């Protein structure tokens, strides 16, 4: 009954990507744009992400470093501004939408001078530098990749982590199956599907947490910390 892979829901992969690019090209370069009309939840999100991340910053043998993070599907840099720049000496951003990266230079202000690379690339086409990032943060974008491209992107991210580095995925989760949104050209996957993909990429879960205090009407949101 339920679909378990993107190959059951995507009619044409090239159109899946091209429609998403067109969709984001016509979104305003604002927090409300990044958050689909839910700009007001940004502080709830950031506070929770911060607490989640701080778990991994404690002193000890496995402490995650604080030299460099990578914000994936960063948009205008909502997460880079409020979560990552305060904690990491430098941050790189990657996003498909050039207009958002241009706006980021304004949005981020003076602290944005510590954004090193602004990569304008789809994740499916991006190979982060080996041994470069303490944290790779992937939020509200995995639904834009096919299962094969998401698994491969996660493998490339694994190869980019510094010692003790982590990947964080934070995204919408479906109650069951794999659900296409043909307006923004994305999919929403259930927790079993996402865990399968992570496993396929050679990654393991360090922690999984549901986001609390969200509007009742929206898809549930989870965070996963991986290595």
């Amino acid at each position: 009954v339920p679909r378990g892979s993107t190959s059951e829901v995507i009619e044409d992969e090239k159109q899946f990507y091209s429609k998403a690019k067109t969709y984001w090209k016509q979104i305003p370069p604002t927090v409300d744009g990044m958050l689909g009309g839910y700009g007001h939840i940004s502080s709830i999100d950031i506070n929770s992400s911060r607490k989640f991340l701080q778990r991994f910053l404690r002193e000890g043998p496995n402490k995650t470093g604080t030299s460099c993070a990578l914000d994936c599907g960063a948009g205008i840099g909502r997460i880079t501004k409020r979560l990552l720049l305060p904690l990491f000496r430098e941050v790189d951003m990657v996003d498909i939408t050039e207009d958002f990266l241009v706006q980021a230079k304004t949005y981020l202000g003076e602290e944005g001078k510590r954004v090193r690379n602004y990569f304008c690339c789809g994740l499916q086409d991006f190979t982060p530098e080996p041994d470069s990032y303490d944290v790779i943060w992937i939020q509200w974008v995995i639904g834009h990749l096919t299962d094969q491209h998401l698994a491969e992107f996660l493998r490339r991210c694994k190869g980019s982590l510094r010692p003790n580095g982590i990947i964080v995925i934070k995204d919408n989760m479906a109650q069951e199956g794999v659900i296409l949104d043909d307006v923004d050209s994305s999919v929403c996957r259930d927790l079993d599907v996402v865990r399968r993909i992570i496993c396929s990429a050679g990654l393991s879960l360090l922690a999984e947490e549901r986001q609390e205090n969200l509007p009742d009407e929206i898809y549930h949101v989870y965070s996963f910390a991986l290595r």
Partner: peptide, 6 residues
């Protein structure tokens, strides 16, 4: 983005 359950 965060979004309404379809």
């Amino acid at each position: 983005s965060p979004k309404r359950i379809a």
